[PDB]
Amino acid sequence: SPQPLEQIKLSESQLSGRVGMIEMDLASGRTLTAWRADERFPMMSTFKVVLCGAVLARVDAGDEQLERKIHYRQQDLVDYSPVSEKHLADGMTVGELCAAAITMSDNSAANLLLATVGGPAGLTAFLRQIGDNVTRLDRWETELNEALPGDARDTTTPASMAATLRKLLTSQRLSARSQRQLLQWMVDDRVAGPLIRSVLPAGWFIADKTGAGERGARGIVALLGPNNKAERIVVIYLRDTPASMAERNQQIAGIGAALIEHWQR
Numbered sequence: 001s002p003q004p005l006e007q008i009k010l011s012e013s014q015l016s017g018r019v020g021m022i023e024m025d026l027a028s029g030r031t032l033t034a035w036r037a038d039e040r041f042p043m044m045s046t047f048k049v050v051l052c053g054a055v056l057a058r059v060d061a062g063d064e065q066l067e068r069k070i071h072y073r074q075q076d077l078v079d080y081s082p083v084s085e086k087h088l089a090d091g092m093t094v095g096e097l098c099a100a101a102i103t104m105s106d107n108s109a110a111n112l113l114l115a116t117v118g119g120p121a122g123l124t125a126f127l128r129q130i131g132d133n134v135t136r137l138d139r140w141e142t143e144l145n146e147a148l149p150g151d152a153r154d155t156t157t158p159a160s161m162a163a164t165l166r167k168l169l170t171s172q173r174l175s176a177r178s179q180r181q182l183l184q185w186m187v188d189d190r191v192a193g194p195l196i197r198s199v200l201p202a203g204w205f206i207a208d209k210t211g212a213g214e215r216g217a218r219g220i221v222a223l224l225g226p227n228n229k230a231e232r233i234v235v236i237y238l239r240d241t242p243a244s245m246a247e248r249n250q251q252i253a254g255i256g257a258a259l260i261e262h263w264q265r
């Protein structure tokens with residue numbers, strides 16, 4: 001495999017779109033690999049990890065309970081509601097909604113959660129409260145995936161997203177139990193977790209959230225490491241590429257291979 005930076009460059013060339021990537025040590029925050037790390041990319045569904053961080057912050061403050069049942073109606077549902085469409089009559093708890101949003105990519109669950117945290121503006125305010133002055137959410141599902149060229153709405157940068165994920169998971173801004181819950185939701189991702197495990201060598205940890213959007217936009221935020229430990233945050237975003245989903249997936253996997261084969265940096 002090429003060196004990781006070389007592989008990222010090769011991927012960007014093969015995809016004919018922009019790639020953004022960071023590799024960061026979870027414990028220390030050091031940046032090991034960076035490529036277009038200060039450029040903007042649509043978050044797509046990856047925003048949901050930050051969303052549930054904001055929910056957990058409210059729980060810690062005594063302003064929310066993961067047990068609280070949210071009642072909703074059919075008119076509230078948007079595209080891709082695999083869990084939430086089943087619970088019109090019995091509702092879902094706030095915690096169940098975070099599980100659906102992060103582990104099943106349920107868009108309506110994400111919108112219900114957004115309403116509990118003050119909407120996109122509330123989520124952006126939370127980002128500023130934790131020192132992320134770059135990432136921004138402006139719209140609800142599904143419009144936040146529009147990925148218009150040059151539009152800063154609903155974007156992050158690889159560097160900001162990595163730092164924010166590290167803050168949420170490890171910095172003691174969230175309580176010990178809340179940090180553990182956020183991590184566990186990422187561990188339990190059903191959309192990409194098992195697929196990734198099927199191609200990871202034995203002994204490698206993965207936790208993740210993936211997203212896809214318009215104009216080829218694709219991303220992953222992940223925790224990865226050897227010896228069954230979450231050693232590094234890896235954030236990869238793709239935008240403005242015409243490539244098939246399979247090819248985007250394969251290029252992201254190829255960056256992963258390069259990282260694994262050149263891990264000691």
Ligand SMILES: OC[C@H]1O[C@H](O[C@H]2[C@H](O)[C@@H](O)[C@H](OCCCCCCC3CCCCC3)O[C@@H]2CO)[C@H](O)[C@@H](O)[C@@H]1O
Nearest residue numbers: 196199200201220222224234252253254256257260261
């Ligand atoms: O010497 C290291 C390893 O080399 C190979 O492992 C291969 C593996 O067989 C292949 O399937 C994977 O593809 C890459 C799979 C990456 C999965 C997704 C990565 C995501 C998740 C993390 C965020 C970035 C992207 O590459 C590795 C490294 O060459 C050997 O198969 C394995 O026995 C050996 O332990």
